[PDB]
């Protein structure tokens, strides 16, 4: 999208995510809401607000002419309001079909670029390179375990046999074939691992209160990446370099 599309449409979608397809997470968010936020989602079950898709369809083909290099990016400023002022005047069924056929040729032009190049084989990397983008890329107390953790995570995406690595709205999940607790939230695992990069195992009155703050989410992520690392990895005598040689030898021994 340019984008002309809003994000987080939960005020229109939380009520047919409970009735249709029976989401338990949508129920837990819905009971939490105040009474005013709750009544603005009960009407959208009854009547759904109809949105005009004309300016989103016209702006879809102005971005294609930029993508083909037909016109400069400063020209979709004036040319968009010159094409919307024409379809407001001469609006008819013969025009509304002309927008859809041109829009149908945009998706058919790029779906041919997907099947011929076979980028569906690299569908794991596209979701994953989008995830490692908005990250800070410079952590305090770390930065050699942090760079090496991403490289062993990109290695698991390419070398593991069947990883789906899909995403929900806000975050990115990751599903492997170990049944049960397949899924790992990669986003909330990097907020738990925000402080635990340059931690060294020196200051412990009792063992614990460092390895106990590792939640059950990010502990499973440290279990999936454990066979695909080495000792020529995370810098030695740290906290994360001794987890990854503990979880490696509880998988290489449990065979």
């Amino acid at each position: 999208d340019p984008g002309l599309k809003p994000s987080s449409l939960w005020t229109h979608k939380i009520i047919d995510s409970i009735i249709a397809n029976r989401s338990l997470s949508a129920v837990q968010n819905f009971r939490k809401q105040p009474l005013a936020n709750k009544l603005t989602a009960l009407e959208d079950a009854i009547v759904q607000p109809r949105k005009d898709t004309t300016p989103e369809t016209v702006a879809a083909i102005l971005q294609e002419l930029v993508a083909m290099g037909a016109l400069q990016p400063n020209e979709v400023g004036p040319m968009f309001s010159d094409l919307m002022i024409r379809v407001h005047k001469y609006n008819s069924t013969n025009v509304q079909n002309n927008l859809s056929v041109l829009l149908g040729d945009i998706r058919a032009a790029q779906s041919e670029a997907i099947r011929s190049t076979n980028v569906g084989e690299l569908s794991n990397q596209v979701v994953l390179n989008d995830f490692l983008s908005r990250e800070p890329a410079v952590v305090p107390q770390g930065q050699h375990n942090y760079e090496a953790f991403k490289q062993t995570l990109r290695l698991m995406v390419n070398e593991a046999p069947n990883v789906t690595l899909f995403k929900s709205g806000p975050d990115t999940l990751m599903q492997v074939n170990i049944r049960g607790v397949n899924t790992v939230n990669l986003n909330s695992a990097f907020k738990n691992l925000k402080n635990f990069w340059g931690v060294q195992l020196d200051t412990e009155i009792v063992p614990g209160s460092i390895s106990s703050k590792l939640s059950s989410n990010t502990r499973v992520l440290l279990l999936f990446l454990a066979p695909f690392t080495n000792d020529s990895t995370f810098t030695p005598d740290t906290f994360i370099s001794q987890i990854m040689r503990l979880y490696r030898e509880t998988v290489a021994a449990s065979i």
Binding site: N91, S92, T93, Q96
Partner: protein, 50 residues
């Protein structure tokens, strides 16, 4: 007493309404003491689609 034809209405008729009454030469005529009019809405066309 007059009888005018159809003229299109606005979609939101406010509470306070400007009634300006003038002569041929764009001046406020002071010799009027009683004036009133009626407006009845009717449907001319639809601005829905197509």
């Amino acid at each position: 007493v007059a009888d005018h034809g159809i003229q299109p209405l606005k979609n939101s008729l406010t509470g306070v309404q400007r009634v300006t009454l003038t002569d041929d030469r764009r001046r406020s005529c002071p010799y009027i003491y009683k004036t009133l009019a009626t407006v009845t809405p009717k449907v001319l066309s639809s601005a829905t689609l197509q």
